[PDB]
Design a protein around this nucleic acid. Sequence first.
RNA 1: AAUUUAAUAUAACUAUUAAUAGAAGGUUACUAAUAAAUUAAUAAUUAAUUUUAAAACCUAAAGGUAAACCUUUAUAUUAAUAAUGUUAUGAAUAAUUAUUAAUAAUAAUAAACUAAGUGAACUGAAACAUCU
Lengths: 159, 104, 44, 130, 99
Amino acid sequence: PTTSNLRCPDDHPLWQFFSNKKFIRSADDLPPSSHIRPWSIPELRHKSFNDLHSLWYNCLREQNVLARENHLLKNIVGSTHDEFSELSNSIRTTMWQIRHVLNERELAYSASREFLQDESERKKFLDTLANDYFLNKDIPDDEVASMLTRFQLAIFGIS
Amino acid sequence: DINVSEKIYKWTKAGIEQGKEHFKVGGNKVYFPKARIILLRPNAKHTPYQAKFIVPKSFNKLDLRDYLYHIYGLRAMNITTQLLHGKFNRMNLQTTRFREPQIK
Amino acid sequence: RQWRLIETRKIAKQPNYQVGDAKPLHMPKERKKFPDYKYGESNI
Amino acid sequence: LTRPWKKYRDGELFYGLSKVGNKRVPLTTKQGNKTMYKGTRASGIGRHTKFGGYVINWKKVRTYVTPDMVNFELKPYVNANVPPLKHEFKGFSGGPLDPRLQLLKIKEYIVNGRVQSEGATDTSCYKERG
Amino acid sequence: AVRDVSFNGSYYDADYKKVMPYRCVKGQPDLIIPWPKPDPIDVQTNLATDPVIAREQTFWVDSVVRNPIPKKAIPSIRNPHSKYKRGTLTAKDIAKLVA
RNA sequence: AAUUUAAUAUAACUAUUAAUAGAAGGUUACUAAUAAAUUAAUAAUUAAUUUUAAAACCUAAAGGUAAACCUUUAUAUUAAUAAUGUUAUGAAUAAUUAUUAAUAAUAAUAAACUAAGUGAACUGAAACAUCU
Ligand SMILES: [Mg+2]
Ligand SMILES: [Mg+2]
Ligand SMILES: [Mg+2]
Ligand SMILES: [Mg+2]
Ligand SMILES: [Mg+2]
Ligand SMILES: [Mg+2]
Ligand SMILES: [Mg+2]
Ligand SMILES: [Mg+2]
């Protein structure tokens, strides 16, 4: 059987397991450790759920590429360079930081709800929010509408 | 009127034609999976239309199909499982012997 | 006479629980139905 | 001659290094009578049938959900030039899980309406409040 | 040359983009030996996020009624069947236990 | 500005004396990770006092087994914004719902010391049975 009979697409989804369609990356092709750093918890604290989700899957795809390269390295040539391994470890660090952030975000939301279940704190919070900006001495006129829209969207389910 | 195998075949055809999954998606959603799969070099017994992976031991055939489709867009038409054995080894004769990992 | 084989019986002291204390690891399946005998069941 | 490089009896076995060893190691899929089935925690999907088959319960099958519009810009790593951001929570004993902190954040959201944080606007900021 | 060197405090070095100690000659506190100048930096790899995109904020706390994280995504964030966390007691439980 | 003696380590046990106190292992893998707060100290490191996040499977007793397996729908459900494909001629849908309230869970459970039940025989008596 001859391979001349095949039209292999250059955009075949199996190329996503390689970087720049390279069988195995060289030290020059790998990202130098000096210029690279894993994500920080505070930087992931203010990334939307979509952003964290997409970053998770990008991390997983890169880890898959590194995994195949590392398997070829440690199974066939049996070298002890351990570069792909630490690079994937950095990615894994970012991943568990993301997991931590998501958990803490949900727990903080739940704690806020439980705090505002209490009638006393709810009354205090609404009274302060009404006295501070709402019912001002006629200084703000138009932006009060934006404040009210945000209020009805946040404290209640009004869209 | 139509055999269930024929019905499955039309299901897969309809999935491909409409661009959706060529299979039935499950209800146990997993937003953040940390499973990793390893592409492997072809063997003499495979054809250019086949690809083999090293996958988690607790992984599943449907799991591989869904993972490939949603994460990479690769549609696996037929998946087949090969679970390997673990041979005994000992780094030295003066150590407890233990079986090597079983790779899937 | 005195009751040696009854007096020398000991039973583990279950802790007192307030309405907001931590749950015990395992829970009885059914509600308790009699008071507690100071000496418990004989074991001999 | 099993191995052409050993013409005389010296103690080497037909195969392997030792004929004996520990037998109290855990079992696996390849060992046991035909009746033995250990499994790999890979199928709790459906119900066996009274005859021998197996019916898949699709509400228990795992589906890997991915963003509808994926952002192909958050790379796995971050530019080393940006210093690691740090956070300071002064006035809150509960830290990031503090309802008072969340209420302050909601207050400022109400007043300002999705305003960028100092650490976000400045790539050269080492730490920020909240 | 310097015989010995001491460290009496810490400070954030912006050139190193990190916290470093005050390297000072053992003896006079004022005389401080500066840290070496880092080699100039320049990145080209595509696996590193740009600074602006990396630090751009896209999440704000804007609701107390709707969860920012979907219900079906929680199991991937925390184990629901965890043996390392337990609840408290109620009047029903304490009545069940006390004789 | 060196060089040797005598003590001292996160890195041994044993005996005594004096204080203080009554604290996980295994298997292999979708590896089992954290985050902050406080006052007094020339954006801050004293440490030490409070808070926290995660943590797969097995170690008799949610059920079963041939330990790390399997089987039980805590992604399991009344209520809701609309419905595809149909509802024995304005609502009720086997792939389901941004959702909201209610309802079953997790035995890691040491040793030594103490109290109690039943309790030998070897042996000694230069034999042996009372006795020991
Ligand atoms: Mg098979
Ligand atoms: Mg033999
Ligand atoms: Mg056999
Ligand atoms: Mg059990
Ligand atoms: Mg059986
Ligand atoms: Mg006794
Ligand atoms: Mg005698
Ligand atoms: Mg005799």
